[PDB]
């Protein structure tokens with residue numbers, strides 16, 4: 001303990017931003033969604049991530065977020081995320 005830094009590489013269309021998140025166990029999904037919305041100027045979003053099955057899967061909740069981070073720890077402390085609006 002605790003989880004170390006995670007990198008969120010977030011694509012919106014042809015734009016990508018990487019967010020360094022120092023202590024992911026100390027973050028909520030709401031904080032993360034807010035950062036993404038502010039970065040890309042979006043109101044309603046849907047975020048998805050590449051899992052170990054190489055499948056794009058929705059994060060819609062704190063729970064889903066914490067499961068994504070468990071996996072990021074296995075995958076060199078980073079997540080590939082895709083944002084779509086609506």
Ligand SMILES: [Cl-]
Pocket residue numbers: 043044045046
């Ligand atoms: Cl939303």
